[PDB]
DNA sequence: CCTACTGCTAC
DNA sequence: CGCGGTAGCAGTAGG
């Protein structure tokens, strides 16, 4: 008997047949994975192998209504292809279309989450299913394919971050090599795939049947009731703890604690921002790229996203990066207090919360002139730029002149941990910064939204109410001129439209409604004298959904040391930022002076070089460079490397005399020599002025420069709305 | 009273 | 030119 319902299904020839227990079903992650699976069929035969693609992250069958599960075509597709049912407890795979189930995921963190979801799905749906030894299978592929180029040619395959990281630190320096990041399951070429299958028993591992504490760890990972537990489960995790590679048998208990947990950690990392710059890895990459390129002139989002992705080693779909770019630009009421990128297009409106934005290919963006005032360029050389893909990418964090996290706030959903942080008035933030500066007591801050005209009151510490505005403009006629921030027009629109035409369960309570929105909100509502009184008893704000709460009881973020932390007060966040920022201001000056001193040396020896040649004391014309090099050292000339660091001792380590002989012949002309002297003089002056400033003098300098730019920003923003 | 939903980066 | 599904957490409003 054959299946019909599912076309993409490459059903094994002997599936469901007397050899069902022998057949294996390969569940792929995506069609990129599927392509590989069907390509492997040409090697292992269709008789005992079949494959079916999983569309997306799988449904979590825990805490799901039988209706939701039944509605999920994906889950139903598997039950039908495997010939699976609930009743009783599985004893043998004899009653099934297939006798084995193999999981083919990218082998990335999200791929691990897919596996866990499948496992969770099998363990939950089908009692005794995972009891059967050798039922669940896992196909694995390499994470990093290293290629040794110059020294002794051999390719290495690492199946996890740690293995490759222990090599990268303890072996890599000994070779000239290149690392390719093997994501997809859809890119791998066939020349090295036909080998994957010729010897698959090593690319094949088997999940050990359920043992003690296996079911408990699954529940710990996928039980919608154990959020708090995971938090600790992540705290307990010890770096370096990782599954043995090539072992060929996996206990489920330590597949979760050694592989899946890796995803959870990465999940939080990307979903929850850092306290210092209020950025998530994605956002931080975008700005880094925008810094790398000169984004003073606009380019379309569909082009920026791939660009940023390429130069920051972004390992995830570009689509996810493009949306991030959109989110960073969006300038409607209820979105960023300060948008670091300009919405040069239909970047979405307040109506649907930016969801009505145009495709990335229609819109354009660029750096807000104020962005570089916030993230000062002089700080760039200070940060620690993450090493990834044998190549430097974005920093661990940026250090804004003011807590940006407080300016814009943040929201995210990871594993075990969650976050919310509302926006705050930058003017208040700078005020408290001046207070921290002046050894003064901080003033308490309340949530603030750019261009918003509603009112906010504090109920309890960490709790606020947010009111819109409803006014009676006529007998039986009300007018809504403002909604609670983050309350989109379409939400109230549908609600009003509901009361106007009534509903199956609720009787109509609205006589008429209109929309007259301009650069503001304007709902003109008409009520019968009967409803007017009824609304007075319920409250006009309460019955029109013009009241929304704001909770500061879940302000979570990574601290300066990369450790996830929950903040109990707004000032605590600002305080932790301040001291880290102050430290980097002194650190900024110390770096600038060092750099400036080097430049001065560079300029001075360049002048001496030209000067001597003009006297005719030194001659470069002819004379083997070997002989010229000796002359220079013997005259006291120091070598310079690409960074700009001098060497007086006698390669990047030592430097070269390229800063002299590398100059254009132009530099010998008097007009160039004069320009050179002016430059040297300007650098000496820069060094003198710098040494006359304290870390706070410099910080205060940036702050006032920001205040001036911020004022213009507020104008341009109010102008464009 | 439990449910369902919203938000957001990723699949 | 566009639509849809899923994870994960905290809290709020709906049936
Ligand atoms: Zn994938
Ligand atoms: Zn992937
Ligand atoms: Zn191999
Ligand atoms: Zn065993
Ligand atoms: Zn990631
Ligand atoms: Zn990487
Ligand atoms: Zn610290
Ligand atoms: Zn969609």
Full 3-state SS string of A238-265: CCCCCCCCCCCEECHHHHHHHHHHHHHH
Is A465 part of a structural domain of the chain? yes
DSSP A126-165: STTTTTSTT-EEEE---SEEEEE-SSS--EEEESSHHHHH
Same domain, A395 and A462: no
Residues A525 and A496 sit within 8 Å (Cβ to Cβ): yes
**DSSP helix/strand/coil, A566:** strand
Looking only at Cα atoms, what is the longest distance across chain A? 105
Boundary of a domain, candidates A237, A271, A305: A271
CA atoms within 13 A on the CB side of A686: 16
**DSSP helix/strand/coil, A58:** coil
Same domain, A278 and A267: no
DSSP A84-98: ---SS----GGGSS-
Same domain, A407 and A495: no
DSSP assignment letter at A668: G
- The secondary structure of A589-639, three-state, reads HHHHHHHHHHHHHHHHHHHHHHHHHHHCCCCCCCCCHHHHHHHHHHCCCCE
Count of structural domains within chain A: 5
Ligand 8 centroid from CA A114, angstroms:
20
**DSSP helix/strand/coil, A527:** coil
Same domain, A135 and A149: no
Domain that holds residue A177: 142-188
Residues A512 and A526 sit within 8 Å (Cβ to Cβ): yes
Q: Judge whether A362 counts as a catalytic residue.
A: yes
Same domain, A276 and A326: yes
Same domain, A401 and A468: no
- By what technique were these coordinates determined? X-ray
Nucleotide nearest A228, CA–C1', reads C9
Nearest-angstrom CA–CA distance, A145 and A159: 9
Nearest-angstrom CA–CA distance, A144 and A127: 38
A282 touches strand B (CB under 7 A): yes
Is A415 part of a structural domain of the chain? yes
Same domain, A225 and A302: no
Cα A489 to Cα A259, A332, A465, A652: the distances in Å are 44, 12, 19, 60
Is A1 part of a structural domain of the chain? no
Boundary of a domain, candidates A516, A542, A568: A568
How many other C-beta atoms lie within 10 A of the C-beta of residue A153? 10
A498 touches strand C (CB under 7 A): no
CATH of the domain at A148: 3.30.1490.30
CATH of the domain at A657: 1.10.268.10
Is A291 part of a structural domain of the chain? yes
Residue in the structure block whose two tokens are 């390669």: A651
Is A254 part of a structural domain of the chain? yes
Boundary of a domain, candidates A246, A271, A296: A271
CA atoms within 13 A on the CB side of A501: 6
Same domain, A520 and A564: no
Nearest-angstrom CA–CA distance, A167 and A143: 13
Q: Please identify which of the residues A164, A362, A398, A579 carries the catalytic annotation.
A: A362
Nearest-angstrom CA–CA distance, A692 and A688: 7
Nearest-angstrom CA–CA distance, A670 and A529: 92
Same domain, A394 and A412: yes
Protein A574 CA to nucleic acid B4 C1', in Å? Answer: 36
Nearest-angstrom CA–CA distance, A180 and A192: 14
Is A406 part of a structural domain of the chain? yes
Residue count (chain A)? 721
Residue whose CA lies closest to nucleotide C12 C1': A549
Q: Give the ligand at the shortest distance from the Cα of A31.
A: 1
Nearest CA to A243 among A232, A234, A256, A230?
A256
Is A585 part of a structural domain of the chain? yes
DSSP assignment letter at A544: T
Same domain, A498 and A642: no
A437-446 own/partner pairs: CB under 8 Å, 24+ apart: A437/A696, A437/A699, A437/A700, A442/A571, A442/A574, A442/A575, A444/A570, A444/A571, A445/A406, A445/A570, A445/A571
Same domain, A206 and A103: yes
Is A19 part of a structural domain of the chain? yes
Nearest-angstrom CA–CA distance, A571 and A578: 10
Ligand 7 centroid from CA A325, angstroms:
30
A222 touches strand C (CB under 7 A): yes
Same domain, A68 and A206: yes
Residue A89: phi and psi, rounded to 5, are: -130, 130
CATH of the domain at A122: 3.40.50.670
Cα A53 to Cα A38, A60, A78: the distances in Å are 10, 17, 10
């Amino acid at each position: 008997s054959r299946i019909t319902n599912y076309p993409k299904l490459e059903d094994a020839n002997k599936a469901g047949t007397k050899e069902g227990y022998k057949c294996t079903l390969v569940l792929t992650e995506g069609d990129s994975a599927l392509s590989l699976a069907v390509a492997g069929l040409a090697v292992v035969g269709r008789d005992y192998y079949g494959c079916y693609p999983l569309r997306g992250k799988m449904l979590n069958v825990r805490e799901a209504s039988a209706d939701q599960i039944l509605k999920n075509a994906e889950i139903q597709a598997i039950k039908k292809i495997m010939g699976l049912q609930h009743r009783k407890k599985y004893e043998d795979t004899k009653s099934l279309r297939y006798g084995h189930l193999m999981i083919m995921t990218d082998q990335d963190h999200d791929g691990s989450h897919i596996k866990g979801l499948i496992i969770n799905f099998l363990e939950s749906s089908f009692p005794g299913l995972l009891d059967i030894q050798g039922f669940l299978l896992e196909f694995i592929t390499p994470i990093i394919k290293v290629s040794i180029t110059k020294p002794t040619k051999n390719t290495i395959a690492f199946y996890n971050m740690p293995d490759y990281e222990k090599w990268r630190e303890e072996e890599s320096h000994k070779f000239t090599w290149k690392q390719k990041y093997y994501k997809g399951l859809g890119t791998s070429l066939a020349q090295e795939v036909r080998e994957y299958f010729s010897n698959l028993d090593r690319h094949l591992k088997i999940f050990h049947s359920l043992q003690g504490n296996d079911k408990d760890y699954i529940d710990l990972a996928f039980s919608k009731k154990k959020a708090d537990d995971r938090k600790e489960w992540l705290r307990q995790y010890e770096p370096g703890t990782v599954l043995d590679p090539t072992l060929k048998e996996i206990p489920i208990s330590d597949f979760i604690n050694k592989e899946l947990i890796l995803f959870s950690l990465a999940d939080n990392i990307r979903s929850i921002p850092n306290v210092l710059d209020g950025f998530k890895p994605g956002q931080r990459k975008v700005l880094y790229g925008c810094f790398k390129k000169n984004l003073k002139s606009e380019l379309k989002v569909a082009q920026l996203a791939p660009y940023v992705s390429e130069c920051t080693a972004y390992h995830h779909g570009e689509q996810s990066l493009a949306q991030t770019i959109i989110g960073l630009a969006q300038n409607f009421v209820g979105s960023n207090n300060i948008y670091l990128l300009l919405p040069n297009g239909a970047f979405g409106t307040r109506a649907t919360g930016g969801k009505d934005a145009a495709a990335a290919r229609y819109i354009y963006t660029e750096l807000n002139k104020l962005t570089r005032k916030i993230f000062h360029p002089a700080d760039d050389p200070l940060y620690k730029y993450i090493q990834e893909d044998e190549k430097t990418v974005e920093p661990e964090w940026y250090l804004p002149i003011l807590p940006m996290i407080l300016v814009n706030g943040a929201e995210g959903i990871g594993t075990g941990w969650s976050t919310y942080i509302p926006p705050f008035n930058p003017l208040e933030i700078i005020k408290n910064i001046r207070h921290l500066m002046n050894d003064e007591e901080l003033e308490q801050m309340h949530p603030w939204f750019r261009g918003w005209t509603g009112t906010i009151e504090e109920i309890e510490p960490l709790r606020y109410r947010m009111y819109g505005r409803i006014e009676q403009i006529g007998d039986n006629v009300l007018e809504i001129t403002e909604l609670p921030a983050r309350t989109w027009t379409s939400t109230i629109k549908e609600y009003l439209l509901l009361g106007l035409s009534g509903n199956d369960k609720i009787k109509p309570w609205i006589k008429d409604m209109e929309e007259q929105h301009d650069d503001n909100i304007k709902f003109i509502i008409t009520l019968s004298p009967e409803e007017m009184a009824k609304t007075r008893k319920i409250g006009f704000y309460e019955r029109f959904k013009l009241i929304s709460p704001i909770s500061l009881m879940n302000m979570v973020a990574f601290d300066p040391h990369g450790k996830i932390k929950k903040y109990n007060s707004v000032n605590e966040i600002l305080s932790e930022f301040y001291y880290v920022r102050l430290e980097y201001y002194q650190k900024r000056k110390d770096h600038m002076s060092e750099r400036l001193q080097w430049e001065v040396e560079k300029y001075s020896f360049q002048v001496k070089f030209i000067k001597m040649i003009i006297e005719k004391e030194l001659t470069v014309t002819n004379k083997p460079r070997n002989a010229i090099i000796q002359e220079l050292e013997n005259l006291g000339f120091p070598r310079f490397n690409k960074e700009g660091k001098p060497y007086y001792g006698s390669e990047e380590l030592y430097g070269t005399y390229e800063y002299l002989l590398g100059m254009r012949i132009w530099s010998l002309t008097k007009e160039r020599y004069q320009k050179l002297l002016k430059q040297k003089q300007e650098k000496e002056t820069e060094l003198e002025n710098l040494l006359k400033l304290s870390a706070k003098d410099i910080w205060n300098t940036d702050l006032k420069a920001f205040e001036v730019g911020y004022q213009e920003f507020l104008q341009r923003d109010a102008e464009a709305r």
